[PDB]
Point group: D2
Chain length 387, copies 4
């Protein structure tokens, strides 16, 4: 019941089920997984593919011969299981050299190094069949006001992304970029902190068509924002290239709980939106099995991610197909929201006495919106109190 299949396009980062449980206050509680074991276990649970940072697969500072042997094992595991690699990314945050950032580090030589590290892994991503390259600028930011001139840093960030668009264009690579926003942690404030800031930044790049967003449930909620609303704005702009699914309990540290946990009604409205919009990209889980768990709990947590999506997908479809919800949407005038305000045009609007001179504002004000019934129907469907 609610069994995931590869057609559901569920993907996992190597670093998700691979997380050893080291947090700001504690040591690791689990040993490291071989990426090959991760690929095989995830295939048996019904996953579609896996994603990776360069440093998840290739030990930092590996020689080229040493790099080749690491890829070849991962290689074979993907071949054996039919697992795809739809997305890859760069670790520009763990090594101490990135303590003030990669692309916007104050030191110029670190910025050049970060670009070279990124470009090497783009090559590898394309070889493995990745269609999306994610950038999470986790160290781009500041703890204090004078440490970072944000106008200069945005110049440096634009320069880096423009150079990367140049590289893939010169190589003829069929790959797009997705910026993953986060408001804070591990920096006090991170540049491009929300979906909105990232969307605005993309419009100033030299070729904006190459760049989209990879929003994460928990990151927008870390700013108290409505995640389905932000996803709707990304869809409206044509910029939802990828998505990170997990759970988060409000405004605190980045929890990365399994999808479904955290804010359950936001999860319901998110799945309703993705499915009714026909989003066809990967459903990627950027989550961390809590460090209380042994490895059997790791795979239970990963399976739970996939199961909760499938349950919510079923309830959202039942909600939209219910004839009673039908009528309630018409009663709340959702179909009128979808109609133009003034397709007659500006001149006609200015000459329409019914729009102002003779508009009965008191009668219009008395009309109820009937939102609370509509919402209780949605609650009933989520909880299985109707079908």
């Amino acid at each position: 019941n609610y069994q995931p299949t590869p057609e559901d396009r569920f993907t996992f980062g190597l670093w998700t089920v691979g997380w050893q449980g080291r947090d700001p206050f504690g040591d690791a509680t689990r040993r490291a997984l071989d990426p090959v074991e991760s690929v095989r276990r995830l295939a048996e649970l019904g996953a579609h593919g896996v994603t990776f940072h360069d440093d998840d697969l290739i030990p930092f500072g590996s020689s080229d011969s040493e790099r080749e042997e690491h890829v070849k094992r991962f290689r074979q595991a993907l071949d054996d299981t039919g697992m795809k690699v739809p997305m890859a990314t760069t670790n520009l945050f763990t090594h101490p050299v990135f303590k003030d950032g990669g692309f916007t580090a104050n030191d110029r030589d670190v910025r050049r190094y970060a670009l070279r590290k990124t470009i090497r892994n783009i090559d590898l991503a394309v070889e493995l069949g990745a269609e999306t390259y994610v950038a999470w600028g986790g160290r781009e930011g500041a703890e204090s006001g004078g440490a970072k001139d944000v106008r200069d840093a945005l110049d440096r960030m634009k320069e880096a992304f423009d150079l990367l668009g140049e590289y893939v264009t010169s190589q003829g690579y069929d790959i797009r970029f997705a910026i993953e926003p986060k408001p804070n942690e591990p920096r006090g404030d991170i540049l491009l902190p929300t979906v909105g800031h990232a969307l605005a930044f993309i419009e100033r790049l030299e070729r904006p068509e190459l760049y989209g967003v990879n929003p994460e449930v928990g990151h927008e909620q870390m700013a108290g924002l409505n995640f389905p609303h932000g996803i709707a704005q990304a869809l409206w702009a044509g910029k939802l290239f990828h998505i990170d699914l997990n759970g988060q309990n409000g405004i605190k540290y980045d929890q990365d709980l399994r999808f479904g946990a955290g804010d359950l009604r936001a999860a319901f409205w998110l799945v309703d939106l993705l499915e009714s919009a026909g989003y066809s990209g990967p459903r990627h889980f950027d989550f961390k099995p809590p460090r209380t768990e042994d490895f059997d709990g790791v795979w239970a947590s990963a399976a739970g991610c996939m199961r909760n999506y499938l349950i919510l997908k079923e309830r959202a479809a039942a909600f939209r197909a219910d004839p009673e919800v039908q009528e309630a949407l018409r009663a709340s005038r959702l179909d009128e929201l979808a109609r133009p305000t003034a397709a007659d045009g500006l001149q006609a609007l200015l000459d329409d006495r019914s729009a102002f001179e003779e508009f009965d504002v008191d009668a219009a004000a008395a009309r109820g919106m009937a939102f609370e019934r509509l919402d209780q129907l949605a609650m009933d469907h989520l909880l299985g109190a109707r079908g």
Copy 2:
């Protein structure tokens, strides 16, 4: 000492000092102010100008006869004091007809009425010499997920702003629009909730050059965001058309405290940024004197807004003029942040062996950033524990 003059460009909304103290849990504590009296008292305090909603100046429902008397009195008060009207805006949130929004109400007739109400006040704003027209969509949004399809709502919001841009260009008006974001309150979630979301939305308008942002200190802080960082991104995009200054203590209801209150160091870094970037627009206070105050406290609170700006301006200037701070900025490599990462081009960067193959990452990782020394110098300057 720290006395404002009209040259400082301090402006205030009629609705700020005119707030009667009604909050969700309590009735008014102050009598209503005559707009003419506000203009005169504000001029006596050293203000540069005043701003208004249509309904602050002209009582809602006023006959075309009564509307003319109200503007005449106000124009006369402006002339007698000198005082300017740099910006105006529409009240699309108080009357019950707007309970589901103005531009994005589900009911089409409400949406047409909201546009007609706005266009009438654009005409009045231009006659009074306003250069900026502000839109705060306080009722655009939702409490529940099914009540608003956000993709349709963004279509309607774009339709509204495109029509307004058509109107002003057809009349030859030399006015620009500024969107004022806010994440929530009075709606559970408000559309375009942060500076970034509004900046992104503007790029999809038909004539994006006509539109910028009017960010408010407290509104970005209601999402836990760094207001100076968000202002920097607006400046970087060429979109800071106007600014609302006030105070806010973190993530809670919108407090609208006087400027300087709330987060004091963020106010310092904001004034440093505005003054160093050469922002030339109004320094506008969107604040509410607390309802504990009588009219003497109203005027004391308004004077405090201006005074705190002027103190912070002095300390930020002293900070940037200090040779020891200039040293510390070079020690933290802020000057290198301003340097192109790779003006030598993509190919040169790829061939530069010093950027990767022979980059000593451990030596680079060992470099201290000297940020804490720089920040304590900024502390000392703010507190006047050095000159």
Copy 3:
């Protein structure tokens, strides 16, 4: 299906369904309800009783004859419907005289007035059969640091509550007090901001046995706290006298959505706790039907409060009775949490080599807690994915 009955002990404040929709930015959207109509409508929906502020029932400044006629109508409506009045409270926040507080107003004469207003309504509460008297100190606090010496204010707050305990003891009234915490709004910070602060304060009253807490879902969540955890601490201390149920979407203004909305999984764990602890007080909804709604939406919202509680009660009971959840609780050692750590006593613990000298910390560390399976079983039960 999921039909409320008076035995479920659901209660509503007159001010909940009576809320006219006036918020900080908008006028009322609904006319006022006669308390008699409220009592009759709520009885037909299956409610158990109603609660009131003095000012909900008796217009402020009513004469004694005028007071008598208002009570007599309410009176008869309760008699006709069998509705109970289990709780009442005082409005010490709406009138401008309370702008700096009631019990902790700086002005001594206002503090005496607040006590006299409270004592009059205690008499009325007892006449109507109330067993709990709630105090929400909504104006007790400050916007600025110097306005309120909190040690002096806590002295004044203790003095007020001690005097009230004296009054009911002298009159022989069978009634208890419950303090309703809230962290902020309408004051910048409110004294006793959380359940914990209120519990601590009660221990310094002259007769602590007379005082408990009335926690509200949304208020604890306004501080980002775990509401079920706080309710557990109140139960542990023997202090849960009353509870306010509603919904809240994280850290923002006090939304007072209908119960079930906001944080749905917290609602599930709250009902699980209340039912398994055998809480026998009223299930009181302190909520506000959104101002988008007409009166038919008001009653739909109120019915939804009751329905969601009953659905969650069913899912929580099914969760606890599931033999698979059974085993999972034993697998996660919840029964071991309920056993003493050292019932053998201090001397035996100090002499137990297995507790330290010979404890195998590495073997103990390797044990998984199996929390993620347990939690996915709970998710499955909430969503009706198992029975």
Copy 4:
């Protein structure tokens, strides 16, 4: 200028300046410090003393032989510099055995081990002259609702603290316990999450006089609470045994910035309260120099903690000494707040017609509170815009 001396009682944890910079997303940026070197560097900066976790001083797993050498070296360093050890604490959060807690772990054998580990370090703390023993239950709590029955967990926490109180009283030790609250991180929710919750819990211990709180600036601010207000309630209850000073920017991960950073006006009001109440304990800094810094920045950040305290102390003293501020305090009736509301008794209050029957509420409502003038004087004093 603003130079610390041992008389100022500034103390630092070994783990503060000794933090190597490991965060959830990054490896260490600094080498480990020898405790003897920290003691000497801190003494050179003007510190009064140092504090420690057992595992900061003695490497975990040390033989009883190796443990003695470590303490001897440290005692010698203390003697050479003078330096005191006013408080000590137990690390019950780093080792993986504590992944579900120490005192409230579901596994009983872990709970017994946590007690034995703590009791060993109490003996060491007393030998080094510590007067306060701090407990931060960083791992007590949960990520999911069913993992922890909080009522049983509070039974186990009380059992643990009662046993510790039995131990110290049986040995004749003259040490007191201080509970350090925190709302979340590293657990999703931590038990006893705020100052109020811990104060309430203490009153249910067997010997409550032995236990107080160790509040931390950033931890209360992680719940959006007013830290000076919470300190005032701890003082009012006689329970402020110790304090942790640092900086935090609002509701996010625990930043542990140096004191003065974060919320600057709250730091001012905190220092005003501590100094005016005559708090005599240590001024302890629980902070982390940012991982961007080298060892020069570590020491600069520590010096900044002390310097910012001393600047704020001067400005708060000037504020309270200013005759114009004393005037403003009387104008705001702070002196009347300090007056008993009804020292004449319940019966006299009931018979006082001036308190209700003849109280002119509209005249009282008209009184301005003059809070904004008072607060701007406090501003001026903090910024040194008056003397």
